[PDB]
Amino acid sequence: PSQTVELFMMEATLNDPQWSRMFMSFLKHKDARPLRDVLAANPNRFITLLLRLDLQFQAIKIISIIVKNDDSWLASQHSLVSQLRR
């Protein structure tokens, strides 16, 4: 998962709507426990990418997929809530 996330989250790939749509199909698969874990452990890229509207929307979309199946999480006071508040 380490090499794949760095290639699929690149801005040049995220600009094309077809590439983004195909990626979301992969991320919604139920057998991605070893794949979605690395996304939740790397919030640095999200901060630099969340803060051009379509790219922000894709940042908005990716959050739901990692939260809709991982509700028992995010009980701290980290900056992700602060950026979403802004």
Side-chain angles (χ1 to χ4, degrees):
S2 297
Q3 184 182 1
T4 64
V5 295
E6 295 293 328
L7 183 62
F8 290 158
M9 293 177 71
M10 182 179 72
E11 186 178 1
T13 62
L14 290 174
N15 287 318
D16 190 73
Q18 203 49 23
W19 194 297
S20 297
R21 179 65 65 192
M22 171 285 258
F23 182 76
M24 294 182 286
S25 67
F26 274 10
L27 195 63
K28 291 181 181 180
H29 199 270
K30 276 141 211 172
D31 186 74
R33 176 53 92 73
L35 181 63
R36 283 189 289 268
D37 197 2
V38 71
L39 276 76
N42 291 320
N44 196 2
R45 190 169 174 84
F46 290 90
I47 289 170
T48 63
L49 188 152
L50 173 149
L51 292 176
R52 275 280 289 181
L53 293 174
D54 293 331
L55 180 138
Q56 201 145 340
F57 182 76
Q58 293 175 359
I60 293 298
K61 178 67 181 294
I62 190 167
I63 301 299
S64 65
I65 304 304
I66 205 164
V67 175
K68 277 171 70 175
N69 55 4
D70 193 65
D71 53 353
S72 66
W73 183 65
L74 190 152
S76 66
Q77 161 179 87
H78 61 280
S79 295
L80 183 61
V81 181
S82 180
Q83 271 79 66
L84 294 174
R85 180 177 181 270
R86 286 172 26 76

Coordinates of all heavy atoms in Angstrom, one line a residue:
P1 N 0.8 -1.2 0.0 CA 0.0 0.0 0.0 C 0.8 1.3 0.0 O 0.4 2.3 -0.4 CB -0.8 -0.1 1.3 CG 0.0 -0.9 2.2 CD 0.8 -1.9 1.3
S2 N 2.1 1.2 0.4 CA 2.9 2.4 0.5 C 3.2 3.0 -0.8 O 3.1 4.2 -0.9 CB 4.3 2.0 1.2 OG 4.0 1.6 2.6
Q3 N 3.5 2.2 -1.8 CA 3.8 2.8 -3.2 C 2.5 3.2 -3.9 O 2.5 4.2 -4.6 CB 4.6 1.7 -4.0 CG 5.0 2.2 -5.4 CD 5.7 1.2 -6.2 OE1 5.8 0.0 -5.8 NE2 6.1 1.5 -7.4
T4 N 1.4 2.5 -3.6 CA 0.2 2.8 -4.4 C -0.4 4.1 -3.9 O -1.0 4.8 -4.8 CB -0.8 1.6 -4.2 OG1 -1.2 1.5 -2.8 CG2 -0.1 0.3 -4.7
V5 N -0.4 4.4 -2.6 CA -1.1 5.6 -2.2 C -0.3 6.8 -2.7 O -1.0 7.9 -3.0 CB -1.2 5.6 -0.6 CG1 -2.1 4.5 -0.2 CG2 0.2 5.5 0.0
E6 N 1.0 6.8 -2.8 CA 1.8 7.9 -3.3 C 1.6 8.1 -4.8 O 1.7 9.3 -5.2 CB 3.3 7.7 -3.0 CG 3.6 7.7 -1.5 CD 3.4 9.0 -0.8 OE1 3.6 10.1 -1.5 OE2 3.0 9.0 0.4
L7 N 1.2 7.1 -5.5 CA 1.0 7.3 -6.9 C -0.4 7.7 -7.2 O -0.7 8.5 -8.1 CB 1.3 6.0 -7.7 CG 1.2 6.0 -9.2 CD1 2.1 7.0 -9.8 CD2 1.4 4.6 -9.8
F8 N -1.4 7.2 -6.5 CA -2.8 7.5 -6.7 C -3.3 8.8 -6.2 O -4.2 9.4 -6.7 CB -3.7 6.3 -6.1 CG -3.6 5.0 -6.9 CD1 -3.9 3.8 -6.3 CD2 -3.1 5.0 -8.2 CE1 -3.8 2.6 -6.9 CE2 -3.0 3.8 -8.9 CZ -3.4 2.6 -8.2
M9 N -2.6 9.3 -5.1 CA -2.9 10.6 -4.5 C -2.2 11.8 -5.2 O -2.3 12.9 -4.7 CB -2.6 10.6 -3.0 CG -3.5 9.6 -2.3 SD -3.1 9.5 -0.5 CE -3.7 11.2 0.0
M10 N -1.4 11.5 -6.2 CA -0.7 12.6 -6.9 C -1.7 13.5 -7.6 O -2.7 13.1 -8.1 CB 0.3 12.0 -7.9 CG 1.1 13.0 -8.6 SD 2.3 12.3 -9.8 CE 1.2 11.7 -11.1
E11 N -1.4 14.8 -7.6 CA -2.3 15.8 -8.2 C -2.6 15.6 -9.6 O -3.7 15.8 -10.1 CB -1.8 17.2 -7.9 CG -2.7 18.3 -8.3 CD -2.2 19.7 -8.0 OE1 -1.0 19.8 -7.6 OE2 -2.9 20.7 -8.3
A12 N -1.6 15.2 -10.4 CA -1.8 14.9 -11.9 C -2.8 13.8 -12.1 O -3.5 13.9 -13.1 CB -0.4 14.6 -12.5
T13 N -2.8 12.8 -11.3 CA -3.8 11.7 -11.4 C -5.2 12.2 -10.9 O -6.2 11.7 -11.4 CB -3.4 10.5 -10.7 OG1 -3.2 10.7 -9.3 CG2 -2.0 10.0 -11.3
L14 N -5.2 13.0 -9.8 CA -6.5 13.4 -9.2 C -7.2 14.4 -10.1 O -8.4 14.6 -9.8 CB -6.2 13.9 -7.8 CG -5.8 12.9 -6.8 CD1 -5.5 13.6 -5.5 CD2 -6.9 11.9 -6.5
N15 N -6.5 15.1 -11.0 CA -7.2 16.1 -11.8 C -8.2 15.5 -12.8 O -9.2 16.1 -13.2 CB -6.2 16.9 -12.6 CG -5.4 17.9 -11.7 OD1 -6.0 18.5 -10.8 ND2 -4.1 18.0 -11.9
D16 N -7.9 14.2 -13.3 CA -8.8 13.6 -14.2 C -10.0 12.9 -13.5 O -9.7 12.1 -12.6 CB -8.0 12.5 -15.0 CG -8.8 12.0 -16.2 OD1 -9.0 12.7 -17.2 OD2 -9.3 10.8 -16.1
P17 N -11.2 13.2 -13.9 CA -12.4 12.7 -13.2 C -12.4 11.1 -13.3 O -12.9 10.5 -12.4 CB -13.6 13.3 -13.9 CG -13.1 13.7 -15.2 CD -11.6 14.1 -15.0
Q18 N -12.0 10.6 -14.4 CA -12.0 9.1 -14.6 C -11.1 8.4 -13.6 O -11.4 7.4 -13.0 CB -11.7 8.7 -16.0 CG -12.3 7.3 -16.5 CD -13.7 7.1 -16.1 OE1 -14.5 8.1 -15.9 NE2 -14.1 5.8 -16.0
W19 N -9.9 9.0 -13.4 CA -9.0 8.4 -12.5 C -9.5 8.4 -11.0 O -9.4 7.5 -10.3 CB -7.6 9.1 -12.6 CG -6.5 8.3 -11.9 CD1 -6.4 8.0 -10.6 CD2 -5.3 7.8 -12.5 NE1 -5.2 7.4 -10.3 CE2 -4.5 7.2 -11.5 CE3 -4.8 7.8 -13.8 CZ2 -3.3 6.6 -11.8 CZ3 -3.6 7.2 -14.1 CH2 -2.8 6.6 -13.1
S20 N -10.1 9.5 -10.7 CA -10.7 9.7 -9.3 C -11.8 8.7 -9.1 O -11.9 8.1 -8.0 CB -11.1 11.1 -9.1 OG -10.0 12.0 -9.1
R21 N -12.7 8.5 -10.1 CA -13.8 7.6 -10.0 C -13.4 6.2 -9.8 O -13.9 5.5 -9.0 CB -14.7 7.8 -11.2 CG -16.0 6.9 -11.1 CD -16.9 7.2 -10.0 NE -17.5 8.5 -10.1 CZ -18.1 9.2 -9.2 NH1 -18.3 8.6 -8.0 NH2 -18.6 10.4 -9.4
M22 N -12.4 5.8 -10.6 CA -11.9 4.4 -10.5 C -11.2 4.2 -9.1 O -11.3 3.1 -8.5 CB -10.9 4.1 -11.6 CG -10.2 2.8 -11.6 SD -8.8 2.7 -10.4 CE -7.4 2.8 -11.5
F23 N -10.5 5.2 -8.6 CA -9.8 5.0 -7.3 C -10.9 4.8 -6.2 O -10.6 4.0 -5.3 CB -8.9 6.2 -7.0 CG -8.2 6.1 -5.7 CD1 -7.1 5.3 -5.6 CD2 -8.6 6.9 -4.6 CE1 -6.4 5.2 -4.4 CE2 -8.0 6.8 -3.4 CZ -6.9 6.0 -3.3
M24 N -12.0 5.6 -6.2 CA -13.0 5.5 -5.2 C -13.6 4.1 -5.2 O -14.0 3.6 -4.1 CB -14.0 6.6 -5.3 CG -13.5 8.0 -5.1 SD -14.8 9.2 -5.3 CE -15.1 9.3 -7.0
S25 N -13.7 3.5 -6.3 CA -14.2 2.1 -6.4 C -13.2 1.1 -5.6 O -13.7 0.2 -4.9 CB -14.4 1.6 -7.8 OG -13.1 1.6 -8.5
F26 N -11.9 1.3 -5.8 CA -11.0 0.5 -5.1 C -11.1 0.8 -3.6 O -11.0 -0.2 -2.7 CB -9.6 0.8 -5.6 CG -9.2 0.0 -6.7 CD1 -10.1 -0.8 -7.4 CD2 -7.8 0.0 -7.2 CE1 -9.7 -1.6 -8.5 CE2 -7.5 -0.8 -8.3 CZ -8.4 -1.6 -8.9
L27 N -11.2 2.0 -3.2 CA -11.2 2.4 -1.7 C -12.5 1.9 -1.0 O -12.5 1.7 0.2 CB -11.1 3.9 -1.6 CG -10.7 4.4 -0.2 CD1 -9.3 3.9 0.2 CD2 -10.7 6.0 -0.2
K28 N -13.6 1.7 -1.7 CA -14.8 1.3 -1.1 C -14.9 -0.2 -1.0 O -15.9 -0.7 -0.4 CB -16.0 1.7 -2.0 CG -16.3 3.2 -2.0 CD -17.5 3.6 -2.8 CE -17.7 5.1 -2.8 NZ -18.9 5.5 -3.6
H29 N -13.9 -1.0 -1.4 CA -13.9 -2.4 -1.3 C -13.7 -2.8 0.2 O -12.9 -2.2 0.9 CB -12.8 -3.0 -2.1 CG -12.9 -4.5 -2.4 ND1 -12.4 -5.5 -1.5 CD2 -13.5 -5.1 -3.4 CE1 -12.7 -6.7 -2.0 NE2 -13.4 -6.5 -3.2
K30 N -14.4 -3.8 0.6 CA -14.4 -4.2 2.0 C -13.1 -4.9 2.4 O -12.8 -4.9 3.6 CB -15.6 -5.2 2.3 CG -16.9 -4.5 2.6 CD -18.1 -5.2 2.0 CE -19.2 -4.2 1.6 NZ -20.3 -4.8 0.8
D31 N -12.4 -5.5 1.5 CA -11.1 -6.2 1.8 C -9.9 -5.2 1.6 O -9.1 -5.4 0.8 CB -10.9 -7.4 0.9 CG -9.7 -8.2 1.3 OD1 -9.7 -8.9 2.3 OD2 -8.7 -8.2 0.5
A32 N -9.9 -4.1 2.3 CA -8.9 -3.1 2.2 C -8.4 -2.6 3.6 O -8.0 -1.5 3.8 CB -9.4 -1.9 1.4
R33 N -8.5 -3.5 4.6 CA -8.0 -3.2 5.9 C -6.5 -2.9 5.9 O -6.1 -1.9 6.6 CB -8.4 -4.4 6.9 CG -7.9 -4.2 8.3 CD -8.3 -2.9 8.9 NE -9.6 -3.0 9.6 CZ -9.7 -3.5 10.8 NH1 -8.7 -4.1 11.4 NH2 -10.9 -3.6 11.4
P34 N -5.7 -3.7 5.3 CA -4.3 -3.3 5.2 C -4.0 -2.2 4.2 O -2.9 -1.7 4.1 CB -3.6 -4.6 4.7 CG -4.6 -5.7 4.9 CD -5.9 -5.0 4.7
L35 N -5.0 -1.7 3.5 CA -4.9 -0.6 2.6 C -5.4 0.8 3.1 O -4.7 1.8 2.9 CB -5.6 -0.9 1.3 CG -5.5 0.1 0.1 CD1 -4.1 0.3 -0.4 CD2 -6.5 -0.3 -1.0
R36 N -6.5 0.8 3.8 CA -7.0 2.0 4.3 C -6.4 2.4 5.6 O -6.5 3.6 6.1 CB -8.5 1.9 4.6 CG -9.4 2.0 3.3 CD -10.9 2.0 3.7 NE -11.4 0.8 4.2 CZ -11.9 -0.2 3.4 NH1 -12.1 0.0 2.1 NH2 -12.4 -1.3 4.0
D37 N -5.6 1.5 6.3 CA -4.9 1.9 7.5 C -3.8 3.0 7.3 O -3.7 3.9 8.1 CB -4.3 0.7 8.2 CG -3.9 0.9 9.6 OD1 -4.2 2.0 10.1 OD2 -3.4 -0.1 10.2
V38 N -3.1 2.9 6.2 CA -2.0 3.8 5.9 C -2.6 5.2 5.6 O -1.9 6.2 5.9 CB -1.1 3.3 4.8 CG1 -1.9 3.4 3.4 CG2 0.2 4.1 4.7
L39 N -3.8 5.3 5.1 CA -4.4 6.6 4.8 C -4.7 7.4 6.1 O -4.5 8.6 6.2 CB -5.6 6.5 4.0 CG -5.5 6.4 2.4 CD1 -5.0 5.0 2.0 CD2 -6.8 6.7 1.7
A40 N -5.2 6.6 7.1 CA -5.5 7.3 8.4 C -4.3 7.6 9.2 O -4.4 8.5 10.1 CB -6.4 6.4 9.2
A41 N -3.1 7.0 8.9 CA -1.9 7.3 9.7 C -1.0 8.3 9.0 O 0.1 8.6 9.5 CB -1.1 6.0 9.8
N42 N -1.5 9.0 7.9 CA -0.7 10.0 7.2 C -1.6 11.2 7.0 O -2.1 11.5 5.9 CB -0.2 9.5 5.9 CG 0.9 8.5 6.1 OD1 1.8 8.6 7.0 ND2 0.9 7.4 5.2
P43 N -1.9 12.0 8.1 CA -2.7 13.2 7.9 C -1.9 14.4 7.4 O -2.5 15.5 7.2 CB -3.2 13.5 9.4 CG -2.1 13.0 10.2 CD -1.4 11.8 9.5
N44 N -0.6 14.3 7.3 CA 0.2 15.5 6.8 C -0.1 15.8 5.4 O -0.3 17.0 5.0 CB 1.7 15.1 6.9 CG 2.6 16.4 6.8 OD1 2.1 17.5 6.7 ND2 3.9 16.2 6.9
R45 N -0.3 14.8 4.5 CA -0.7 15.1 3.1 C -2.1 15.7 3.0 O -2.3 16.6 2.1 CB -0.6 13.8 2.3 CG -0.7 14.1 0.8 CD -0.4 12.8 0.0 NE -0.6 13.0 -1.4 CZ 0.3 13.5 -2.3 NH1 1.4 14.0 -1.9 NH2 -0.1 13.6 -3.6
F46 N -3.0 15.3 3.9 CA -4.4 15.9 3.8 C -4.3 17.4 4.2 O -5.1 18.1 3.5 CB -5.3 15.1 4.8 CG -5.6 13.7 4.4 CD1 -4.8 12.7 4.8 CD2 -6.7 13.5 3.6 CE1 -5.1 11.4 4.4 CE2 -7.0 12.2 3.2 CZ -6.2 11.1 3.6
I47 N -3.5 17.8 5.1 CA -3.5 19.2 5.5 C -3.0 20.0 4.4 O -3.5 21.1 4.0 CB -2.6 19.4 6.8 CG1 -3.3 18.8 8.0 CG2 -2.3 20.8 7.0 CD1 -2.5 18.7 9.2
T48 N -1.9 19.6 3.7 CA -1.3 20.3 2.6 C -2.2 20.3 1.3 O -2.0 21.1 0.4 CB 0.1 19.8 2.3 OG1 0.0 18.4 1.8 CG2 1.0 19.8 3.5
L49 N -3.1 19.3 1.3 CA -4.0 19.2 0.1 C -5.4 19.8 0.3 O -6.0 20.2 -0.7 CB -4.1 17.7 -0.3 CG -4.7 17.3 -1.6 CD1 -4.1 16.0 -2.1 CD2 -6.2 17.1 -1.5
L50 N -5.9 19.7 1.5 CA -7.3 20.3 1.8 C -7.3 21.8 1.7 O -8.2 22.4 1.1 CB -7.7 19.8 3.2 CG -9.0 20.3 3.8 CD1 -9.7 19.3 4.7 CD2 -8.8 21.6 4.6
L51 N -6.3 22.4 2.3 CA -6.2 23.9 2.3 C -5.5 24.3 1.0 O -5.9 25.3 0.3 CB -5.4 24.4 3.5 CG -6.1 24.3 4.8 CD1 -5.2 24.8 5.9 CD2 -7.4 25.0 4.8
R52 N -9.5 24.6 -8.4 CA -8.9 24.0 -7.2 C -10.0 23.4 -6.3 O -9.7 22.6 -5.4 CB -8.1 25.0 -6.5 CG -6.7 25.1 -7.0 CD -5.8 24.0 -6.5 NE -5.5 24.1 -5.0 CZ -4.7 23.3 -4.4 NH1 -4.2 22.2 -4.9 NH2 -4.5 23.5 -3.1
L53 N -11.3 23.8 -6.5 CA -12.4 23.3 -5.7 C -12.6 21.8 -5.9 O -13.0 21.1 -5.0 CB -13.7 24.1 -6.1 CG -13.7 25.5 -5.7 CD1 -14.9 26.2 -6.2 CD2 -13.6 25.7 -4.1
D54 N -12.4 21.3 -7.2 CA -12.6 19.8 -7.4 C -11.6 19.0 -6.6 O -11.9 18.0 -6.0 CB -12.5 19.5 -8.9 CG -13.6 20.1 -9.7 OD1 -14.7 20.3 -9.1 OD2 -13.4 20.4 -10.9
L55 N -10.3 19.5 -6.5 CA -9.3 18.9 -5.7 C -9.7 18.9 -4.2 O -9.5 17.9 -3.5 CB -8.0 19.5 -5.9 CG -6.8 19.0 -5.1 CD1 -5.6 18.9 -6.0 CD2 -6.5 19.9 -3.9
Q56 N -10.3 20.0 -3.7 CA -10.8 20.1 -2.4 C -12.0 19.1 -2.2 O -12.1 18.5 -1.1 CB -11.2 21.5 -2.0 CG -11.3 21.8 -0.5 CD -10.9 23.2 -0.2 OE1 -10.2 23.9 -1.0 NE2 -11.3 23.7 1.0
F57 N -12.9 19.0 -3.2 CA -14.0 18.1 -3.1 C -13.5 16.7 -3.0 O -14.1 15.9 -2.2 CB -14.9 18.3 -4.3 CG -16.1 17.4 -4.2 CD1 -17.2 17.7 -3.4 CD2 -16.2 16.3 -5.1 CE1 -18.3 16.9 -3.4 CE2 -17.3 15.5 -5.0 CZ -18.4 15.8 -4.2
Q58 N -12.5 16.3 -3.7 CA -11.9 14.9 -3.6 C -11.3 14.7 -2.2 O -11.4 13.6 -1.7 CB -10.9 14.7 -4.7 CG -11.5 14.7 -6.1 CD -10.4 14.6 -7.2 OE1 -9.2 14.5 -6.9 NE2 -10.8 14.5 -8.4
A59 N -10.7 15.7 -1.7 CA -10.2 15.6 -0.3 C -11.4 15.5 0.7 O -11.3 14.7 1.7 CB -9.4 16.9 0.1
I60 N -12.5 16.2 0.4 CA -13.7 16.0 1.2 C -14.3 14.6 1.1 O -14.6 13.9 2.0 CB -14.8 17.0 0.8 CG1 -14.3 18.4 1.2 CG2 -16.1 16.7 1.5 CD1 -14.1 18.6 2.7
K61 N -14.3 14.1 -0.2 CA -14.9 12.7 -0.4 C -14.1 11.6 0.2 O -14.7 10.7 0.8 CB -15.0 12.5 -1.9 CG -15.5 11.1 -2.3 CD -17.0 11.0 -1.9 CE -17.5 9.6 -2.3 NZ -17.6 9.4 -3.7
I62 N -12.8 11.7 0.2 CA -11.9 10.6 0.7 C -12.1 10.4 2.2 O -11.9 9.4 2.8 CB -10.5 10.8 0.3 CG1 -9.6 9.6 0.6 CG2 -9.9 12.0 1.0 CD1 -8.3 9.6 0.0
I63 N -12.5 11.5 2.9 CA -12.6 11.5 4.4 C -13.8 10.5 4.7 O -13.7 9.7 5.7 CB -12.8 12.9 4.9 CG1 -11.6 13.7 4.6 CG2 -13.0 12.8 6.5 CD1 -10.3 13.2 5.2
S64 N -14.9 10.7 4.0 CA -16.1 9.9 4.3 C -15.8 8.4 4.2 O -16.3 7.6 5.1 CB -17.3 10.3 3.4 OG -17.0 9.9 2.1
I65 N -15.1 8.0 3.2 CA -14.9 6.5 3.0 C -14.1 5.9 4.2 O -14.3 4.8 4.6 CB -14.2 6.3 1.7 CG1 -15.0 6.9 0.5 CG2 -14.0 4.8 1.4 CD1 -16.4 6.4 0.4
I66 N -13.1 6.7 4.7 CA -12.3 6.2 5.8 C -13.0 6.4 7.2 O -12.5 5.9 8.2 CB -10.9 6.9 5.8 CG1 -9.9 6.0 6.5 CG2 -11.0 8.3 6.5 CD1 -8.5 6.4 6.2
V67 N -14.1 7.1 7.2 CA -14.8 7.3 8.4 C -16.1 6.5 8.5 O -16.5 6.0 9.6 CB -15.1 8.8 8.7 CG1 -16.0 9.0 9.9 CG2 -13.9 9.6 8.8
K68 N -16.8 6.3 7.3 CA -18.0 5.5 7.3 C -17.9 4.1 7.8 O -18.9 3.5 8.3 CB -18.6 5.5 5.9 CG -19.4 6.8 5.6 CD -19.8 6.8 4.1 CE -20.8 5.7 3.7 NZ -21.3 5.8 2.3
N69 N -16.7 3.5 7.7 CA -16.5 2.2 8.2 C -15.5 2.1 9.4 O -15.2 1.0 9.8 CB -15.9 1.3 7.0 CG -14.7 1.9 6.4 OD1 -14.2 3.0 6.8 ND2 -14.2 1.3 5.3
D70 N -15.1 3.3 9.9 CA -14.1 3.4 11.0 C -14.6 4.4 12.0 O -13.9 5.3 12.4 CB -12.7 3.7 10.5 CG -11.7 3.5 11.5 OD1 -11.4 2.4 12.0 OD2 -11.0 4.5 11.9
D71 N -15.9 4.3 12.4 CA -16.5 5.3 13.2 C -15.9 5.4 14.6 O -15.7 6.5 15.2 CB -18.0 5.0 13.4 CG -18.3 3.6 13.8 OD1 -17.3 2.8 13.9 OD2 -19.5 3.3 14.1
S72 N -15.5 4.2 15.2 CA -14.8 4.2 16.5 C -13.4 4.7 16.4 O -12.4 4.0 16.5 CB -14.9 2.8 17.1 OG -14.1 1.9 16.3
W73 N -13.3 6.0 16.2 CA -12.0 6.6 15.9 C -12.1 8.2 16.0 O -13.3 8.7 16.1 CB -11.4 6.2 14.6 CG -10.0 6.8 14.3 CD1 -8.9 6.5 14.9 CD2 -9.7 7.7 13.2 NE1 -7.8 7.2 14.4 CE2 -8.3 7.9 13.3 CE3 -10.4 8.4 12.2 CZ2 -7.6 8.8 12.5 CZ3 -9.7 9.2 11.4 CH2 -8.3 9.4 11.5
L74 N -11.0 8.9 16.0 CA -11.0 10.3 16.0 C -11.7 10.9 17.3 O -12.8 11.5 17.2 CB -11.5 10.9 14.7 CG -11.4 12.4 14.3 CD1 -11.4 12.5 12.8 CD2 -12.5 13.3 14.9
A75 N -11.1 10.6 18.4 CA -11.6 11.1 19.7 C -10.6 12.1 20.3 O -10.8 12.6 21.4 CB -11.8 9.9 20.7
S76 N -9.6 12.5 19.5 CA -8.6 13.4 20.0 C -8.9 14.9 19.6 O -10.0 15.1 19.0 CB -7.2 13.0 19.6 OG -7.1 13.1 18.2
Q77 N -8.0 15.8 19.8 CA -8.2 17.2 19.4 C -7.1 17.6 18.4 O -6.4 18.6 18.6 CB -8.2 18.1 20.7 CG -7.9 19.6 20.6 CD -8.0 20.3 22.0 OE1 -7.1 20.4 22.7 NE2 -9.2 20.8 22.3
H78 N -6.9 16.8 17.4 CA -6.0 17.1 16.3 C -6.6 18.1 15.3 O -7.8 18.5 15.4 CB -5.5 15.8 15.6 CG -6.6 15.1 15.0 ND1 -7.5 14.2 15.7 CD2 -7.0 15.0 13.7 CE1 -8.3 13.7 14.8 NE2 -8.1 14.1 13.6
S79 N -5.7 18.6 14.4 CA -6.1 19.7 13.6 C -7.1 19.4 12.5 O -7.6 20.4 11.9 CB -4.8 20.3 12.9 OG -3.9 20.8 13.9
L80 N -7.4 18.2 12.2 CA -8.3 17.8 11.2 C -9.7 18.5 11.4 O -10.3 19.0 10.5 CB -8.5 16.3 11.0 CG -9.4 15.8 9.8 CD1 -8.8 16.3 8.5 CD2 -9.5 14.3 9.8
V81 N -10.2 18.4 12.7 CA -11.4 19.1 13.0 C -11.3 20.6 12.8 O -12.3 21.3 12.4 CB -11.9 18.7 14.4 CG1 -13.2 19.3 14.8 CG2 -11.9 17.2 14.6
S82 N -10.2 21.2 13.2 CA -10.0 22.6 13.0 C -10.0 23.0 11.6 O -10.7 24.1 11.3 CB -8.6 23.0 13.6 OG -8.4 24.4 13.5
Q83 N -9.4 22.3 10.7 CA -9.5 22.6 9.2 C -10.9 22.5 8.7 O -11.4 23.3 7.9 CB -8.5 21.8 8.4 CG -7.1 22.4 8.3 CD -6.3 22.2 9.5 OE1 -5.9 21.0 9.8 NE2 -5.9 23.3 10.2
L84 N -11.6 21.4 9.1 CA -13.0 21.2 8.7 C -13.9 22.3 9.3 O -14.9 22.7 8.7 CB -13.5 19.9 9.1 CG -12.9 18.7 8.4 CD1 -13.3 17.4 9.0 CD2 -13.1 18.8 6.9
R85 N -13.6 22.8 10.5 CA -14.3 24.0 11.1 C -14.1 25.2 10.2 O -15.0 26.0 10.0 CB -13.8 24.2 12.5 CG -14.5 25.4 13.2 CD -14.1 25.5 14.7 NE -14.8 26.6 15.3 CZ -14.3 27.8 15.4 NH1 -13.2 28.2 14.8 NH2 -15.0 28.8 16.0
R86 N -12.9 25.4 9.8 CA -12.6 26.6 9.0 C -13.3 26.6 7.6 O -13.9 27.7 7.2 CB -11.1 26.8 8.7 CG -10.3 27.2 9.9 CD -8.8 27.1 9.7 NE -8.4 27.2 8.3 CZ -8.4 28.3 7.6 NH1 -8.7 29.5 8.2 NH2 -8.0 28.3 6.3

